[PDB]
Amino acid sequence: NSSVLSLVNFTVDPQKAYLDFVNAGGAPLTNCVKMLTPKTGTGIAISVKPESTADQETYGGASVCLYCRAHIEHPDVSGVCKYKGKFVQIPAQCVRDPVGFCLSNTPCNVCQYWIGYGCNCD
């Protein structure tokens, strides 16, 4: 973890640095805070309480945020993290790299579900 975390301090593009790293076979960041939940939630991406369905796992938000985890400035225009203090649902098949998943996906706006992983707006 100390490896990839220090790696994104050597770049102006932490997102691409992390994604390129795991895409090249590097080990994803571990120690994400995986919650225990009744798989009976709504399945939206980010939520005030856990909302995993049977096909998801819920994580503590700060622990799956690259910027929180590496203690680097968040890119959001408001300066406030979109995950920290909230819970993030990850598709079950992507639990190997929740930090990469969040860096690679976007929740819908007219709808709170991951685009491509629950958002049925098209």
């Binding site: 919650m35 225990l36 005030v48």
Partner: protein, 291 residues
Amino acid sequence: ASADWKPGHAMPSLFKVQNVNLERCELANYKQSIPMPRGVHMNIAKYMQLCQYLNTCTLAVPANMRVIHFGAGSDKGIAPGTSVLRQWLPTDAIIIDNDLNEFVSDADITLFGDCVTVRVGQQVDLVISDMYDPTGSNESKALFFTYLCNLINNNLALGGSVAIKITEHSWSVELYELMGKFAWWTVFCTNANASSSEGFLLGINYLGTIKENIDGGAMHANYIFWRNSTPMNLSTYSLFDLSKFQLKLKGTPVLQLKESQINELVISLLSQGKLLIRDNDTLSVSTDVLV
């Protein structure tokens, strides 16, 4: 074993009333560890089971509930317990956490450094401590316990509660005796960490006045006597059904009262978990620059 399905074991009055010497703690399942589902830190089960037991206690649960979590960090630089507290507590609860070392958490406010640097401007409603210092006789310890004892006497709302981690060697005479100023108290040991002398000293509903006269050194001897007497099997079966895990939204009222106005009705309401007495301003918690 119904106790397999409970979140843990609570020290009974059967052992609180004993009079024995402090002995070594000898646990039959020592060096054993409960397995966790892949990716789940053990402290997730431990904190969940603590919250599950507190769900059976008369906790005061107001709007804008003021929670401080000491010793929230880990060598991994994460805070699983704080995330459990976020899952458990009302959405409008304010979580402040603290640790000597850097970490990232889902708390509303996170303060690094010795807990003694943590300045509580206003009284809080619930204190959770997992603070533990790994560094011949087993005498009462000072450490962060001096700070926590003072916090209870000054910065805890009437009706507020605490859950403070102790072990065989990490404990405090003064902190046991402060439990006598709550309406009820116990030591709670999670099933998930049953093979450890760890327990959570619980004070439920602070009264600011002595309800029970406790000899703190003798009571720690009774705690160890209880642990030595009581089979506890590793287990997390209590975590199988989480449909009622969240803390009840009790809407507990917050009142400002002078000491002279606190009559038998008020004591009774505090003691039933139905009232808090403290300011209702906005909470201010910050790092003080010491020495």
